[PDB]
Structure formats: structure tokens, C-alpha cells
From a paper:
The Nsp15 enzyme is active as a 234 kDa hexamer consisting of three dimers. It was reported that NendoU cleaves both single- and double-stranded RNA at uridine sites producing 2′,3′-cyclic phosphodiester and 5′-hydroxyl termini. To evade host pattern recognition receptor MDA5 responsible for activating the host defenses, the Nsp15 cleaves the 5′-polyuridine tracts in (-) sense viral RNAs, which are the product of polyA-templated RNA synthesis. In addition to biochemical data, we report five new structures of the enzyme in complex with 5′UMP, 3′UMP, 5′GpU, uridine 2′3′-vanadate (UV)—a transition state analog, and Tipiracil—a uracil derivative.
The structure of the complex with UV was determined at 2.25 Å resolution. UV binds to the uridine binding site as observed in the structures with 5′UMP, GpU, and Tipiracil. The uracil moiety is recognized by Ser294 and Leu346 defining the uracil recognition and interacts also with Tyr343. One oxygen (O2′) atom below the plane is interacting with His250 and the other oxygen above the plane is in contact with His235. The vanadate position is consistent with 3′-phosphoryl group that is cleaved in the RNA substrate and observed in the GpU and Tipiracil complexes. The vanadate interacts with key catalytic site residues including His250, His235, Lys290, Thr341, Gly247 and has several water-mediated interactions. Particularly, Lys290 makes hydrogen bonds to O2′ and one of the vanadate oxygen atoms in the plane reminiscent of Lys41 in RNase A. These interactions confirm previous experimental observations for Nsp15 and are consistent with the proposed SN2 mechanism. The structure also provides insights into the structure of 2′,3′-cyclic phosphodiester, which is the product of transphosphorylation reaction. This structure suggests that Nsp15 should follow a two-step reaction mechanism with the final product being 3′UMP. The Nsp15 mechanism of catalysis is consistent with that of RNase A as observed in the structure of the complex with UV transition state.
Residue numbers in the entry:
A (entry chain A), B (entry chain A), C (entry chain A), D (entry chain B), E (entry chain B): 0 to 346
Write the structure that this text describes.
């Protein structure tokens, strides 16, 4: 059954744990796993987790290598544990959940989710696995994803992108958009209307709408003129203000990407994890403008336009709730004389 | 007052220590600081210093987040300690000074620089902080920086660039050029005439003079012809010689940048720190030419021209002293028959 | 003689160990070596090996800084130890061999290869060093490299590239192609006909033949038409198939380089070492196609064409042996109705 | 500087650092220093300090092997650093002082005490070493020990015992009683008329007076009668109360020794260091009585009798300062109806 | 190879590795091996060796639990490695040998001693195991122990005592006296006529002869009289001098045992390993006499009397070679006027 040397055999021969028989010699020094190859030791894994090195090594080998939802999605849905699989958080380089079910003896709380210890927990079920749809039908609290329809259950469509081996992508040779289902205390839940973040990054940013194409290809004055955005303070919120010591606005990722192609800047991710809203310590190299906590979100520009245009601007300041990635994101809206001053999210 | 959990609260909520009240749960494993977020541990800080992890974590959170002089400047001025702040050396990923004054209990030698323990040390004072100019007037040995004039003190103007959160830049939304002052044994010192290095890097090198623009845009034969530099061995010193096994010359950073755009090469910084002269183990990928110790300095090309043209060339070899970044840099000048052979600095 | 502080003196002053006299203060914390510079500690070396930090630090300082064969070459020839030098494996960031001869007291099994302990081992000799050719003539088992001819020994010509300080290159200011010789049990061996891998990488890939230039500059249909490669399944083997969940083929490095310029992808080197065949866990960002174990080899495209055209295609599946880098590489050849289906190597 | 391997050579060949020349192979793993003895590694030093392993090993090797004052004596005199020697704290298994003077390059703030940086520090001088008395006269702050009189210096006779290699004892083949002198800001200070602790331990404990001899053999009631100790709470202060959950009194070490021979108990030294007054968490194995903080001190019984009998019993609670080991010890004095209730020291 | 979890299973269920099948959950943290016992982690092995934690744990589990020779015996015979077993050095808490033969894949240089790589190594064979005597005949270098005679092999009778699980004793329910044989380069060597050390320790010490019985009960003067030891410096060599600062003589263990019962003292084993002659840094608790290097050996008193009485006292200083534990021990012999002054062993 279980064996450290057998786990390393699979990694060496199959790139991951594939249930194959065999053993290779291993050495444990510090938080690193080595193996002997022609008389020399070769590093296989460096433990960046809070778990023992041999345990964390086992879970990483048994990680899910299929398209899975991003961890922030699972977090916003309150997933506590997965059923007979391991979700690897590549943002944290660690397992997404503390315990396991029928995966690793050191972390297993149960062999099956049918066991009594799993009832209060929100177990994640994968409909692509045989028998897991019915396990969800018998689970007290759980979350389920499927590719197609499910009889007797009104689905909730997720985002276009999913994580495959740490790579977030919109699948073309594989399906990445799932139907979502959730039960709480044996009662199926009606998932709310939500926006979805795009999970893009600066180095490889690509526009996904004609408005996003126009935003990047055109100038600030023309873009505001084309889409009639006067009074909404896009210069501050999206384009960002760099004239002063403290950086102004710059809360949309597409705004950061437009600047990065022309002027570099430093982003310090002082909370390195997968979350819908990301906070950064930013310093602009060209001007010297900086801000300690700059909340950034990767919303589609069209969706962001709809949100800010759907608000009341008669109050100097108030808190705005927006359901994004199935979680309720709080926004700070500042207005003066019927026009927007700033509008930023909070974590 | 002090608290590890309170320090992490500020980092999580404010990106740094901002004196706010609150606590978050933390874990110390190896040289890393974690915190719990929705039941999982998230890395906040990895100790790359020789100090205890919790102490180094505290100093990094309390680091100075305003434009500060680069560490090499402070080193050349003999700064031993800073007054009620922490200068973070991003080149070393560690505090620039061993002890502190009124910052961290574990490293504090004093609460104020007025205390008797601070008299022999060269304390760094920031004139932008209230009351620190007069503290410098009462300090026995110290260094002071200001933005404007100071009554009764003849200032010394520093370089255009300063470090902001590890980013060296010439500020446009903030001031980065300061006036410099120094006292030794209660006696104000007259700072010497000095050149200043430019603190640029290869990936983002930008010319800062028409001569530098001509150097990068033109060829070697034309550049020497335009600025009449025959007999000074710029082909060796600046452009570099790659025909032989040992690399020849290549001691100016602008020379490295011109090559890097056309041919890649490997630079091994065997002394990773902030210093006016940087020594590298270089290996040219295209040709195979290499040199163990290649001293490199980032001087403005015009300033470098003035220096080498201001020397006597009648001796085969001698040592040349040049005041750069307020420190006296030794150069090796080799000549033959009234013409320069090579001219390189030493660390 | 030997001294930790003296070794660090050479590194600081000469970039490596140069047998110079002097000492500097050092600190050992975790797997890292520091030294004091103006009262602060500066990191000199981080031990990424399975050896003690001070020992590994000594061997790294005494590493060979001349053009040396790549480790995979030495591995395929069965080199167990080097004579009075240290070969540093930059792929593993560790010594290429466990023990040493006359280098470090902690790892020395002998002072000279003439000693009785060295007879069974395959000792690597460098003909560029004085007296090492005759030592090879007296060694029982050994490997030798030279630049020119050797009297009484029929040479075997190696590859054009060699490793210089971790930089694999074809030397232009230095010679990188050597003559190879090997003795087993006092008997000179006749080295077999072998192909050689090119040791290129994706970021800096350059074609080395007109066929390689045509492969990158032209389309798939035209390239197959120009070089008449119908029925050999280059679309699968070289260009790669991304239409399905599992990635198809893509076993030649030049195929990866052509894709990388247009579409990015993730390569996970789960066995980080120098080997003729490299296995990767690949995930294509654009399509989502992936494969756990994708064997890749960097053969010249012309050589690869010659190999696959020199095979019999009448069997559904068989194992093909090819001598590459002096080792016998096993290939899997799949055919159907006289045409190639796939052809990939194994490690 | 110097050589780590040379330090290890002296240890194996001289038991300590004797300045002899020679070197041996050394391995540094974890916080442990090993050496190769005929192929196998032998542990030489387990670093239990807060300093780097190689540094602390050098300081432990250079520890003072002559009879030296106990660390509690030096601390009570405000000693900050030693002159050209290392005082080893065996009860902490660590150096008694942070920095050094002319001992170890890593910890040296100076090579000689006359250096300007040593002025504000109370430097410890050993008069038994040549030139150290004159260095004391030059020093601004310092403490001096001698075996005889110094010209014009008013001596302070210290305790009979001293520490020889972690062993506290009255020297018979050596002199363990010294004259003590102290300077504060260039001014000699008269040391106070003080008591001294006996520095005995629990398991090996010998009485040093007829009263102490009587205390161990006489019953509680008959001992109080012979020495007229009615109304002084000796039963509580010295004998101890075990009838209640919180342990009553028991603050003299000789009282602990008398009980330990009769009944065992546990002592938790939650502050493991050498100090005049020691605090212990004590649990009695027979009764179950316990106290979280029990202040204990090893005074001669005759001294404690003389001390407690010179007090005024007309106050309900009084703070009493007593000079012991050159420092003021504060006592709590509870009385009722002209009789002592309890009288315990405080740390 | 095999399984780390299987090794831990045998330890908890058999006290050691018994080859049984089964597995238990294991955690590796620091250099400690834990296992889960009803939810909690129980420490199983603290790695005190220079090998990886998992490797050393496997070797300790596979240690030889039969009576084996003491490590000082094997070292004195030049034993480099063991045949299909592990000898545990309990005085080092580490394997007695670096590599293994058919024991652990990580440390195995070979599976069987007949392999060609084991030829230049002195392999230890246990004649009590089937086939090991024949493997000794095939071996080029080796050492063999047996309980009885071997055909045609001239035996060497070893000491009465052996080590059973770190316990040295004379076997009563087992045989601890073996015949010893040795081969050097295929040639059997006659082992020298030797003495043997008694391998007793200080706290638990029993005399083994009437002379030793008399030594412990008789006074110094009356014991020398009964055994006619005038002019042989027994008072210095065996009894020891405490009147001076440097400790005089004291080189026989039975002399140490006689003093320890009367007065305690400290022994610093600065080279903690098993060897025929042990060096200690000694400090006497009563007098204060001390010596940095005090050579001690545990010989029977009758043997030492026989040895010292067969010497020639007509030389001021002489080096004396004595065969003890199959190795030559060098002695310093100082004499004056035909009388012994001191006679101490050297390590």
C-alpha cells in the first residue's frame, strides 16, 4: 500500500503518483526530498508547506492533475475538504485543505465521505468521477461540479477558466467551465448571481472584449469619450494617478497591464495566496508614486463599467456589496456633487 | 506595545507596520513566518538574515518606506546606525545596520539618540522628520539629509536617485535628491568633491546623456571618432575584448548594456551587496571569453571621459584615487608609450 | 594549507579558490555561508547539496572554471571521479561526483590517481593539465580529453559544445571540442559511433542547419513538402498534437521552441539533472492539452531525420536503440500500414 | 579569521585552544561540529547558543580554563565584556558576553581594551595576566580581580569560591578568592559591604558551620530551641509547609537539601541561568504541595540568622534591601504581633 | 528502496527490524522520526548522525542485536565496512561504518561482499551467520569472528567481553569471546600477542583480581608494600597528585574509580568515541587540580604491574610500544636514578 519510496518511484517514472509498483532510494535532508540516480542525489521536492516534508511530498504527488476550480472559488464557497483527491494551491505551493479523505494516512480523517466524520464539513465532489454525484446527494454539506446537466438539480454556471497544474486557462482541448451545486445541512442551496474575475496576469495579459481592446489601443481621453464615462473618475480608478507621493486609484488589473507595457513598477504581494481581491504594495519606478495597500481586481472591463454605472452617487461615502466569485465583495464608493471620486474594493 | 502577533496584524492589514491595534495568529517554522487565513497558513516573510526570524521580521515590517539614500552611500559615509528608523538593504535582503534606536526591543541600544550610548556612533538623521535636525546639531557624530537649505550649515548635494522600497529611481512625484551634512566628534565636516554612480541595471538601462545615446546608437569606430578618444583604449576598457580566453576590460556598466542587447552573458555576483564598485564573474555565451574578477562601475559616460582624460600617461602603472559616492575609489592605470592600455577600479 | 576562512578569502578576492594566502571572518547559519563586510554579514554561498555546508562550499570554490564536458557526457561514459579537480553540476547545483582526489580532505579518497584506491574507479583525466596524459596511460580505468592528437591512441571526437561556468557554448575564443579516450581494466576502448545532443534551451534557441532554419521559418505543410516527410508523422512527433486532452508527441526541442514563440506553456522538470533525454510534465496554456511524461531530446533536426528514415516500418511496435552522447538510447517506434505513428525516446 | 580547522586541531590535541598549529577535517551539520577520525565523524560541539555554530565553537574552545568568578558575580557588577578572554556560562552553555576583545574576529568589537569603542563598556580585567592591571587603569569602566594587593587601590575581598571549568569550589591546589575593584566613568567605586551565597547544589551538599551541621541532624523543634528562634517563622521560611495545596515558604537551599534526602520533589528552573536568587516551580512528590514561584537562595544559615534577627518586627509589611553578591536583594517582611510571619527574597 | 513505513512498523511491533510486513503512518520533522499512535505523534528516533534522518533511522533499525565486538576492537583491526549487517556505535549514537553491503539501498555500495567493489575494503564477517566464513575466504581483505575453530585457520582468541545492544559484558547466557582472523590482500595475517582493556566504566565498577580488590581497600603505602612497587611512581601514575594546579598522573581507570567514590570530579570527553586509550579534561572538585589532556586506559592492574616491571629504568626518556587491543600503544617513560618518574599512555 503506502510507501515513501513507492511514492517517489511514481514521481520519477510517471511524473506523479499513478498507483504503480516499485521503489527508489530517497534521502530526507531539511525540507527537501532527494533520490539517488547513478550514485548522486537529485532533488525531487522542496517542502514549502507547514506540514512534515514526507507528508507534504505525498500530497503533492497525489495532487489533482485535471482541470479544477481555482482555490479562491473553493474558498468563497466554504469548501473545507475534498473527496478522495488533493487540490494543490500553486499560489501558496501547499495543499488547499488541511485534512484528506482516503488519500494519505497521516492526513486522512476518513476513507469515504459517507463516514460520520464528514457530515458537518463541506466536502468537494467531482461529478466527472464515477459515483461522486450520488455521494453529493447523500452528503449533508458539500459542493459539486459537473460538465453537463444533473437531473433534479438546477445548475449554476461557473467561470470559463480553470486551473490545470497551476495553469489557469480557458480550455480548448478540455472543458474548464463547470456547473456548480451546493448543499447545506442536507438542503440544496440556490447559488446567487455573481460576477467572475478573469484570473489574468500582467506578463501575458490579453483583452477579452472590444471595450478592453479599445482601452489598451486608445488613449484615456478618447476611451472616456467613446464609452461616455465622464464623471466616473476612470483616470483615477482605472488609469491611476501618479502626480503625487501616494499613488491614486489603479484598482483594475487591466489598468496595471496598460502601464506595465510602457513603464515598469514593483508589486509586492504581501499576502501570497489565491483571492478574488489582491492587495499589493506598489512603487512606480518612473515617477516614485507609491501606495502601501492597493486593492486590485481582475474584472472584465465591461462588467466593471456595468457595476459602477449601477450605483447611486448622492452620498459622500458608503459601502457597496458586490457578489463576485460567489462571495460578497465590499467596495468603498466616494462621491462629490453627484460625480464619482474613487471606487475600490476591500479584502 | 510590542507584539509579534500585532506586528503581523499591521503587515496583513496595512502592508507594513503602521502602529495599528490588532492581532492575527502566526506560526514560526524554520526561517519563515506564516499566518492563518480561513484555516490555512500563508507565508508572510522568509528570514534571509543572520538575525532571529521573529526579530528580522519585526525590523522588515518597520523598515523605512520613504525615499532613502542607497546603502552604498551610507556605507561610504560611515553610517553605523539610524535614528528611530530601519534602513532595509534590499541587495542583501537584510537590515543595513546591526542595532537600532527606539525601534525593536531586541535590537535597541537606546530609545533616543540623545542617550550616552549613541555619542561615538555615526547616527543617521532624516531632516524630513520633525526635531531630527536639532538632534543632529546635538549629536557628536552623525549624518543628515534634507530637502531644502539649513541655516548655519553649508550643504553638500547628493545624487539624483534614491531607493524607495528597493526601487532606485529619480523621483518625479517625490524628491530623491538631498542635501548632505556630516559631523565628526561634534565638528561639522566639509564633504569632498565626489562623483556619483548612476545605479542602473542591464534589463532597464536608459541613457542619461547625448554621449551615452551616441555610444549605444553608434558603432565603436564612429564613437571614438566623434569624441576624439584615440589612445585611451575604449575598445578594451568600455567595449571589451572577447578575442582571447580571458575577457579584456569591460569595466563600465554601459558597455555591458550595449553587449547584452546583442549577445547574452552570465554575471555571477559573488559578493551580493550594495557597493560603488561591483565585482562579477563573467562568462560570455557567444565567444566563451571569461574573467574571474571583472570590476564594474556605473558612472555617467561623460564623467568617465573627464576622469580618464584628466590623468598623466607617462608611467607604465600607478594607482589613481577618485572620490566617488563620497568614498575614495582606487583605480589601476596602465600605459605604454604615452597611450592608455587599461584603466579599471578595485574594491 | 586547508582553511574555511582562507577559502572564503579567495572567493571574496579572486571569485574562486586561487591558492592565495589570507583569511576573512565567516558565519555558518543553516545551509548558508556568510562573511562580515564593514560590520554586516553578506551571503557567499547557499548549500543546495546533500553534503555539509562547509564541505560543499569548499568544493564549489575549487570547481573547474575551464571548458569542461557536460555532466551527461561524463555520466554516459561512466565517470566515477575526477583527477585533482571538481566538476560542478550546475543543473543539480552540486558536485558531479561524490569523492575527490587531492582536493578536499573531507572528500579525498586519495592524493593522486596513482594510488591503489583509484584503480577500479573510472577517473577523468584532463590532457590540458601537465602529466595527466601519462597518468591516464597508467590508470586501469579512466577517461581522457585532449585538444590535439595523442601518439599511440586513436581519438574519438566529441561534441562542439562544452560547459564553462554552467554556460554551455561552442567556444570561439576558447576550444570546446575535445578528443575522447577511454580505458577499461587497463585496456584502451574503441568508442562507438554516436550522435550528440545540442544542449540548447527555449529562451535562446538558434537554428544550426538550413533545415532547422526552414523548420522555424516555414509552415508545417510546406516543410513536410520541401523535405518529403509524408508518412513519418512529424505533425505528431515534432510539431505536436494539441487537439485532445492528452498532448500528442512533441519530443524534439526544436518543436517546443517553435511553439514557445507563438504560445506559452509550462514545463515542470520533475527530475532536475543533466541527461541526454529530459522528461517534462507539460501543460499547454492556450489549449489545455497536457501530458505527464513527455520525453524531449535536443537533436539536430537533420540528424533526427536521418535516424527515423533509417528504420523499418513493418512492425506495429518495437524498441529502437540509438547511440547518443556515447550512451545507448532506447526509442519506441509505432507504425501502422507501413507509416510511422509515433517515435519517442525513453529515460 | 585564523582557521576553523586549526581550532578543531587544538581541541582534539590539547582539550582546548592552546595556540598550537595544525589542522583536521571538519564537518558542520545542524548546530553540531564534527571531525573525521579514521573515516567516521565524531561530534565535538553541540551549539546551544544564539550565535553561529562555527563562531560559538571557536569561543567555547577559547573559554577561560583558569578559576574565574561565577557569572552571577560578574552580572551583579555590571560586567558587559571581557578583555582578551572568553567567560563561559556553563549554566547557560553559552558565552557570558556577546562581544569579544581580541579573541574572535566575528565577535571582536576591538582588538585591545584601549580602543575607543570599549570606553562605555564595563570591561573585565584579570590581574593574573600581564598588563591587564594597567589596562584597567586606562579603562573608563571596568572590573578587576587580583590575587594580591594593587598599588593604592582599596580592595574588596570576594567570595571563597570560584568557577573552574564549570565547577564551583574552594581552591586548595589553587587560589579561588580574589580582590575586586570597579571603575565607573574613570572613577574608582568602593564596593559595598556584602554577603556572599554559598553556591552549593542539591544532590551534593555539605554543611559549612556547626549551626548548619545541627540543622541537618536536629529536629525542627529542638533546633529552634538551641538557637532561640521562636517567633521567627523558621518552620515556614526554612522548613516549609506541606499541609496545603500552595507550598508554604521554603526559601533557603539548606532547607531544600534536608527534605530531598527524606522525600524527593521536582524543581522546574524556568529561568535557567546563574543568579544570586533562583526561582523554581516546585512540586512535592509525597504531599502534592506546589508553588509556581518559589524564591530560593544559598546563604549560610548563620548569616540568615544574623540577617533576620536585626530586623524590626513592628511593621505589618516592609521592604528590606540587603547587599548580597555585591547587589541589593529585596525582601518581603510580613509580621503580626511582633513576630515574623514570612520573610522571602525576590528576584 | 523497500519502505520507510515498513521499517517503522517493525520497530513498534518487534523492537527492531524483524523483516515482518506491515506499515504505519510516519512523520519526519527536523532530525526526528515520529509516528501517529491514536492521533498523537510519538518520537521513535532522534538522528544524531551525519546521514539523512530516514537513512540513519533505517540503519539503526537494522543494527546488529547479537553480541558484537566493541568498536575500538574493529577499528584497531582496520575494519572499514560490515557484511550484510550494521554495527551501531552507541558511544557515538551513529553507524560504526559509512557504507553498507546488502542492507540499505542508500548506503549500499554492493549487495554481496563478493562484488568487485568490496575487494580493497576490510570487510567484517560474522562466522555465526551461514555462508560468511566462505565469503571471508573469497574476500581480499577481511576480519572474521567465530565461536569455534575454522578449518586450517590459526585463531586469535579475543577479549572475554563483547557489546550487546550497547551493553558491554561477559556473556553468561551467551558467548562473548570469539576467535579472530584477518586477511590483507588475500593473505591471512597472524594477529599479534596482545593485551585487552577491561572496558569498565566509572560509576559501575567491579574489581576483577585480588590485586584490584586489594587496591580498593588497602592504603596507598600498604598496597605498594604488599606488592613491592617502590620506585615505580604508583603514587603519581595510578593514585594521582592533587597538591598542584596541574593534575599529576592518574592514568589508570581503577585509580579514577577509587577517587570518585571518595571525592567527585568532572570528566570532559572532548573526543566522544570508543577507543583503547581515552583522553579526558579533568577537574577535581575538592582541590581544584586540573589537566587539559589526561590519558586514561582500563587495563587490569595485574597486567599494568607486569608491563611496567619489565622495562629498563636506565634511560631518562624512552618510547615504549605495547600491543593492546591488537594495536600498538605508545608510552612515555620518564626515569631518574633507576626509578620510574612517570609512565603514561598516549592517544
Amino acid at each position: 500500500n503506502m510507501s515513501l519510496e513507492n511514492v517517489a518511484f511514481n514521481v520519477v517514472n510517471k511524473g506523479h503518483f499513478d498507483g504503480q509498483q516499485g521503489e527508489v532510494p530517497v534521502s530526507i535532508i531539511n525540507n527537501t526530498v532527494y533520490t539517488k540516480v547513478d550514485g548522486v542525489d537529485v532533488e525531487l521536492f522542496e517542502n514549502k508547506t507547514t506540514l512534515p516534508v514526507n507528508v507534504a511530498f505525498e500530497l503533492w504527488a497525489k495532487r489533482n492533475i485535471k482541470p479544477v476550480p481555482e482555490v479562491k472559488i473553493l474558498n468563497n464557497l466554504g469548501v473545507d475538504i475534498a473527496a478522495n483527491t488533493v487540490i494543490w494551491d500553486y499560489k501558496r505551493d501547499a495543499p488547499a485543505h488541511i485534512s484528506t479523505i482516503g488519500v494519505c494516512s497521516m492526513t486522512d480523517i476518513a476513507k469515504k465521505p459517507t463516514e460520520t466524520i464528514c457530515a458537518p464539513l463541506t466536502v468537494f465532489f467531482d461529478g466527472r468521477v464515477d459515483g461522486q454525484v450520488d455521494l453529493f446527494r447523500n452528503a449533508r454539506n458539500g459542493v459539486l461540479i459537473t460538465e453537463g446537466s444533473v437531473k433534479g438539480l438546477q445548475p449554476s454556471v461557473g467561470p470559463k477558466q480553470a486551473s490545470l497544474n497551476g495553469v489557469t486557462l480557458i480550455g480548448e482541448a478540455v472543458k474548464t467551465q463547470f456547473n456548480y451545486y451546493k448543499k447545506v445541512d442536507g438542503v440544496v442551496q440556490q447559488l446567487p448571481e455573481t460576477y467572475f474575475t478573469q484570473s489574468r496576469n500582467l506578463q501575458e495579459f490579453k483583452p477579452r472584449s472590444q471595450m478592453e481592446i479599445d482601452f489598451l489601443e486608445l488613449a484615456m481621453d478618447e476611451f472616456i469619450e467613446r464609452y461616455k464615462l465622464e464623471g466616473y473618475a476612470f483616470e483615477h480608478i482605472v488609469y491611476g494617478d501618479f502626480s503625487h507621493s501616494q499613488l491614486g486609484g489603479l484598482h483594475l488589473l487591466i489598468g496595471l497591464a496598460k502601464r506595465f507595457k510602457e513603464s515598469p513598477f514593483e508589486l509586492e504581494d504581501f499576502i501570497p495566496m489565491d483571492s478574488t481581491v489582491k492587495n499589493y504594495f506598489i512603487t512606480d519606478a518612473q515617477t516614485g508614486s507609491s501606495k502601501c495597500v492597493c486593492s486590485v481586481i481582475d474584472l472584465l472591463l465591461d462588467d466593471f463599467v456595468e457595476i459602477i454605472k449601477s450605483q447611486d452617487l448622492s452620498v459622500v461615502s458608503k459601502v457597496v456589496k458586490v457578489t463576485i466569485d460567489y462571495t460578497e465583495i465590499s467596495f468603498m464608493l466616494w462621491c462629490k456633487d453627484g460625480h464619482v471620486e474613487t471606487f475600490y474594493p476591500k479584502l
